Design a protein around this motif. Structure first.
Motif, mmCIF file in Angstrom:
data_model
loop_
_atom_site.group_PDB
_atom_site.id
_atom_site.type_symbol
_atom_site.label_atom_id
_atom_site.label_comp_id
_atom_site.label_asym_id
_atom_site.label_seq_id
_atom_site.Cartn_x
_atom_site.Cartn_y
_atom_site.Cartn_z
ATOM 1 N N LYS A 1 36.936 -28.490 -62.112
ATOM 2 C CA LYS A 1 36.067 -29.645 -61.909
ATOM 3 C C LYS A 1 34.880 -29.632 -62.867
ATOM 4 O O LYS A 1 34.358 -30.697 -63.214
ATOM 5 C CB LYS A 1 35.600 -29.705 -60.452
ATOM 6 C CG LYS A 1 34.255 -29.054 -60.170
ATOM 7 C CD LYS A 1 34.045 -28.838 -58.680
ATOM 8 C CE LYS A 1 32.867 -27.916 -58.416
ATOM 9 N NZ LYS A 1 31.655 -28.334 -59.174
ATOM 10 N N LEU A 2 34.448 -28.449 -63.312
ATOM 11 C CA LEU A 2 33.388 -28.376 -64.312
ATOM 12 C C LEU A 2 33.904 -28.795 -65.682
ATOM 13 O O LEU A 2 33.189 -29.455 -66.446
ATOM 14 C CB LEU A 2 32.808 -26.963 -64.360
ATOM 15 C CG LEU A 2 31.469 -26.788 -65.079
ATOM 16 C CD1 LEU A 2 30.512 -25.963 -64.234
ATOM 17 C CD2 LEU A 2 31.670 -26.148 -66.444
ATOM 18 N N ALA A 3 35.139 -28.412 -66.011
ATOM 19 C CA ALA A 3 35.761 -28.896 -67.238
ATOM 20 C C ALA A 3 36.004 -30.399 -67.183
ATOM 21 O O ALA A 3 35.993 -31.066 -68.223
ATOM 22 C CB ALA A 3 37.072 -28.152 -67.494
ATOM 23 N N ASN A 4 36.226 -30.945 -65.985
ATOM 24 C CA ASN A 4 36.383 -32.387 -65.838
ATOM 25 C C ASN A 4 35.074 -33.139 -66.044
ATOM 26 O O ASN A 4 35.105 -34.327 -66.380
ATOM 27 C CB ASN A 4 36.961 -32.716 -64.460
ATOM 28 C CG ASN A 4 38.478 -32.726 -64.452
ATOM 29 O OD1 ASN A 4 39.113 -31.818 -63.916
ATOM 30 N ND2 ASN A 4 39.066 -33.757 -65.047
ATOM 31 N N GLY A 5 33.932 -32.482 -65.850
ATOM 32 C CA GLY A 5 32.650 -33.126 -66.062
ATOM 33 C C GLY A 5 31.776 -33.200 -64.826
ATOM 34 O O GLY A 5 30.969 -34.124 -64.688
ATOM 35 N N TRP A 6 31.922 -32.235 -63.923
ATOM 36 C CA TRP A 6 31.135 -32.177 -62.701
ATOM 37 C C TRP A 6 30.219 -30.960 -62.725
ATOM 38 O O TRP A 6 30.566 -29.911 -63.277
ATOM 39 C CB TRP A 6 32.035 -32.127 -61.462
ATOM 40 C CG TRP A 6 32.846 -33.371 -61.247
ATOM 41 C CD1 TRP A 6 33.849 -33.846 -62.044
ATOM 42 C CD2 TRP A 6 32.724 -34.297 -60.161
ATOM 43 N NE1 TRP A 6 34.356 -35.011 -61.521
ATOM 44 C CE2 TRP A 6 33.683 -35.310 -60.366
ATOM 45 C CE3 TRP A 6 31.898 -34.370 -59.036
ATOM 46 C CZ2 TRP A 6 33.838 -36.381 -59.489
ATOM 47 C CZ3 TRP A 6 32.051 -35.434 -58.166
ATOM 48 C CH2 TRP A 6 33.014 -36.426 -58.397
ATOM 49 N N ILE A 7 29.041 -31.110 -62.119
ATOM 50 C CA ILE A 7 28.040 -30.053 -62.075
ATOM 51 C C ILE A 7 27.590 -29.865 -60.631
ATOM 52 O O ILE A 7 27.735 -30.752 -59.787
ATOM 53 C CB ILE A 7 26.833 -30.357 -62.996
ATOM 54 C CG1 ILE A 7 26.156 -29.061 -63.452
ATOM 55 C CG2 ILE A 7 25.833 -31.274 -62.305
ATOM 56 C CD1 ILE A 7 25.086 -29.269 -64.501
ATOM 57 N N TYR A 8 27.060 -28.678 -60.350
ATOM 58 C CA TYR A 8 26.573 -28.372 -59.013
ATOM 59 C C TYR A 8 25.242 -29.068 -58.755
ATOM 60 O O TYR A 8 24.381 -29.148 -59.636
ATOM 61 C CB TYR A 8 26.421 -26.861 -58.835
ATOM 62 C CG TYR A 8 25.592 -26.464 -57.633
ATOM 63 C CD1 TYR A 8 26.068 -26.653 -56.341
ATOM 64 C CD2 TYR A 8 24.331 -25.900 -57.789
ATOM 65 C CE1 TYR A 8 25.314 -26.293 -55.241
ATOM 66 C CE2 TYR A 8 23.569 -25.537 -56.694
ATOM 67 C CZ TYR A 8 24.065 -25.735 -55.422
ATOM 68 O OH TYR A 8 23.311 -25.375 -54.330
ATOM 69 N N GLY A 9 25.076 -29.574 -57.535
ATOM 70 C CA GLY A 9 23.849 -30.239 -57.148
ATOM 71 C C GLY A 9 23.560 -30.122 -55.666
ATOM 72 O O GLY A 9 24.179 -29.311 -54.969
ATOM 73 N N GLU A 10 22.619 -30.924 -55.171
ATOM 74 C CA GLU A 10 22.253 -30.916 -53.761
ATOM 75 C C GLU A 10 22.678 -32.167 -53.010
ATOM 76 O O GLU A 10 22.949 -32.087 -51.810
ATOM 77 C CB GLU A 10 20.738 -30.734 -53.604
ATOM 78 C CG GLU A 10 20.272 -29.287 -53.685
ATOM 79 C CD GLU A 10 19.960 -28.847 -55.103
ATOM 80 O OE1 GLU A 10 20.305 -29.585 -56.050
ATOM 81 O OE2 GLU A 10 19.368 -27.760 -55.271
ATOM 82 N N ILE A 11 22.743 -33.315 -53.681
ATOM 83 C CA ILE A 11 23.144 -34.575 -53.067
ATOM 84 C C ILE A 11 24.423 -35.049 -53.741
ATOM 85 O O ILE A 11 24.480 -35.151 -54.973
ATOM 86 C CB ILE A 11 22.039 -35.641 -53.177
ATOM 87 C CG1 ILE A 11 20.737 -35.127 -52.558
ATOM 88 C CG2 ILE A 11 22.475 -36.933 -52.505
ATOM 89 C CD1 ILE A 11 20.862 -34.744 -51.100
ATOM 90 N N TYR A 12 25.444 -35.332 -52.937
ATOM 91 C CA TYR A 12 26.716 -35.796 -53.471
ATOM 92 C C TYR A 12 26.577 -37.199 -54.049
ATOM 93 O O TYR A 12 25.909 -38.063 -53.475
ATOM 94 C CB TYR A 12 27.786 -35.781 -52.379
ATOM 95 C CG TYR A 12 29.145 -36.255 -52.843
ATOM 96 C CD1 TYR A 12 29.927 -35.472 -53.681
ATOM 97 C CD2 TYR A 12 29.645 -37.488 -52.442
ATOM 98 C CE1 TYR A 12 31.170 -35.902 -54.108
ATOM 99 C CE2 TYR A 12 30.886 -37.927 -52.864
ATOM 100 C CZ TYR A 12 31.643 -37.130 -53.696
ATOM 101 O OH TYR A 12 32.881 -37.562 -54.118
ATOM 102 N N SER A 13 27.216 -37.422 -55.196
ATOM 103 C CA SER A 13 27.182 -38.723 -55.857
ATOM 104 C C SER A 13 28.448 -38.881 -56.683
ATOM 105 O O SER A 13 28.713 -38.066 -57.572
ATOM 106 C CB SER A 13 25.940 -38.861 -56.740
ATOM 107 O OG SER A 13 26.022 -40.017 -57.554
ATOM 108 N N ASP A 14 29.225 -39.925 -56.387
ATOM 109 C CA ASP A 14 30.461 -40.159 -57.128
ATOM 110 C C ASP A 14 30.180 -40.708 -58.521
ATOM 111 O O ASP A 14 30.837 -40.317 -59.493
ATOM 112 C CB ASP A 14 31.367 -41.112 -56.349
ATOM 113 C CG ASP A 14 32.122 -40.416 -55.235
ATOM 114 O OD1 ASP A 14 32.856 -39.448 -55.527
ATOM 115 O OD2 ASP A 14 31.984 -40.836 -54.067
ATOM 116 N N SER A 15 29.212 -41.623 -58.638
ATOM 117 C CA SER A 15 28.908 -42.220 -59.935
ATOM 118 C C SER A 15 28.289 -41.203 -60.885
ATOM 119 O O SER A 15 28.634 -41.164 -62.072
ATOM 120 C CB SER A 15 27.980 -43.421 -59.754
ATOM 121 O OG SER A 15 27.512 -43.895 -61.004
#
Length: 49
Positions: A35-49
């Motif tokens: 998922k990080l290779a897909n372009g996702w990063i760790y955070g505190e609030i979920y956001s699809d956009s």
């Protein structure tokens, strides 16, 4: 053979202590890396956009 083996009344013995946790950690790390290779990063609030 739609139903070769019936496991309706089969109980898994409690012989799991560490290897299942290690496998779960490895699978979670692989999924997070994908998922990080897909372009996702760790955070505190979920956001699809």
């Amino acid at each position: 053979n739609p139903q070769p083996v019936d496991t309706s009344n089969i109980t898994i013995p409690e012989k799991l202590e560490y290897f299942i946790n290690k496998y779960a950690e490895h699978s979670h790390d692989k999924w997070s890396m994908d998922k990080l290779a897909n372009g996702w990063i760790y955070g505190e609030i979920y956001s699809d956009s």
